[PDB]
Write a protein that binds this ligand. Structure first.
Ligand SMILES: C[C@H](CCCCC(=O)NO)Nc1c(Nc2ccc(OC(F)(F)F)cc2)c(=O)c1=O
Ligand SMILES: [Ca+2]
Ligand code: NA
Ligand SMILES: [Zn+2]
Length: 369
């Protein structure tokens, strides 16, 4: 029990990577998070590391050599010469070409793999990489603003020392990239809670339960618009508890995508920072080596609030609602508070729907030996 050792990864350059004018993915939110938690004084309670830049040698442990060579070569000045390669790898539109794309992928991946190495070495209880959690990237493809799947790479590192690794994804979108990589193995159980029905990426049906050796090791909780803290918490704690009891993993990876928060530019959920962070508190109570990662989140003031509070939660540190002064203070107007209020949006997930989906998952969890 009690307070635990926390290692946090951050590179001072991460906030300078720009996806382009009008693009919702803003790496600057990672800097906003870092600045906000330094101003709360949370650096006193944790070890801050600079990630290494993950190499091609590291990336090719999962990704194809051809895809990684392309990512390492593509620049906005040579796009015309790589036209075929761009369409094949899904680069240029949703996943645009930008200055320092590869470096950005290296730093994002570096923090996740370094966190996994630290946990494997038993030198920390928790590792945090807010620049990670890029769950959509595939063996040979970019998708949903994700080029390199840092989660898969970090999980592969944990598998060197851990027989069973549990993956939890509280981003509003299905973590299809992670699920795909470990679909046919029982050495990784993937658990995703996401909006489902005519929504990106279009995967993550209740009936998608894994295949072969991995059958019953892929868990999906499909949800509708406007889920609140009360509905989410009532299903999250029982599902994770049953997963912990049945699967008994030795390490956990928690993807904390903040696009499941109320008011998100691309999200349809109605969670508050408190409701989102209760997921961290739940997972932390199991006392297993834990890797906390980023993901989506497009109302960057709420991403900074979310991930600052989730770091404070990892540290068992009570932080006041009144925000301290920081370099992005004006972003947190008009209230300048850490916590957010839900909107008036209708919760399309009834309590009966929530209970029925939970019961269906419980039947699948009983199939585990
Ligand atoms: C459907 C796909 C969903 C990606 C979710 C990834 C995630 O959170 N993973 O958990 N992509 C989308 C947009 N893309 C978009 C791209 C560029 C852009 O700006 C532009 F380039 F157009 F100027 C505006 C929107 C949207 O806007 C939007 O939605
Ligand atoms: Ca999810
Ligand atoms: Na699996
Ligand atoms: Zn997302």
């Amino acid at each position: 029990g009690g307070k635990k050792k926390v290692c946090y990864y951050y590179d001072g350059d991460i906030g300078n990577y720009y996806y382009g004018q009008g693009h919702p993915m803003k790496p600057h939110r990672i800097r906003m998070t870092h600045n906000l938690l330094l101003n709360y004084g949370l650096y006193r309670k944790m070890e801050i590391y600079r990630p290494h830049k993950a190499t091609a040698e590291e990336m090719t442990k999962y990704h194809s050599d051809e895809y990684i060579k392309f990512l390492r070569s593509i620049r906005p000045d040579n796009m015309s010469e790589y036209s075929k390669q761009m369409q094949r790898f899904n680069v240029g539109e949703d996943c645009p070409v930008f200055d320092g794309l590869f470096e950005f992928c290296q730093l994002s991946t570096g923090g996740s793999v370094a966190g996994a190495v630290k946990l494997n070495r038993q030198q920390t209880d928790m590792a945090v990489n807010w620049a990670g959690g890029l769950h959509h990237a595939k063996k040979s493809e970019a998708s949903g603003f994700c080029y390199v799947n840092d989660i898969v790479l970090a999980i592969l590192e944990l598998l060197k020392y851990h027989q069973r690794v549990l993956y939890i994804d509280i981003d509003i979108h299905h973590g299809d990239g992670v699920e795909e990589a470990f679909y046919t193995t029982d050495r990784v159980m993937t658990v995703s809670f996401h909006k489902y029905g005519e929504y990106f990426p279009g995967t993550g049906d209740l009936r998608d339960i894994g295949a072969g050796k991995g059958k019953y090791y892929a868990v999906n909780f499909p949800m509708r618009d406007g889920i609140d803290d009360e509905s989410y918490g009532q299903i999250f704690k029982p599902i994770i508890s049953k997963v912990m009891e049945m699967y008994q993993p030795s390490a956990v990876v928690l993807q904390c995508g903040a696009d499941s928060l109320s008011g998100d530019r691309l999200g349809c959920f109605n969670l508050t920072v408190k409701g989102h962070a209760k997921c961290v508190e739940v997972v932390k109570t199991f006392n297993l080596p834990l890797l906390m990662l980023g993901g989506g989140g497009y109302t960057i003031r709420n991403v900074a609030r979310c991930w600052t509070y989730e770091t404070a939660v990892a540290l068992d540190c009570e932080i006041p609602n009144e925000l301290p002064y920081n370099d992005y203070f004006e972003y947190f107007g008009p209230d300048f508070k850490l916590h957010i209020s839900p909107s008036n949006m209708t919760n399309q997930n009834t309590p009966e729907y929530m209970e029925k989906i939970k019961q269906r998952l419980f039947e699948n969890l009983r199939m585990l030996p």
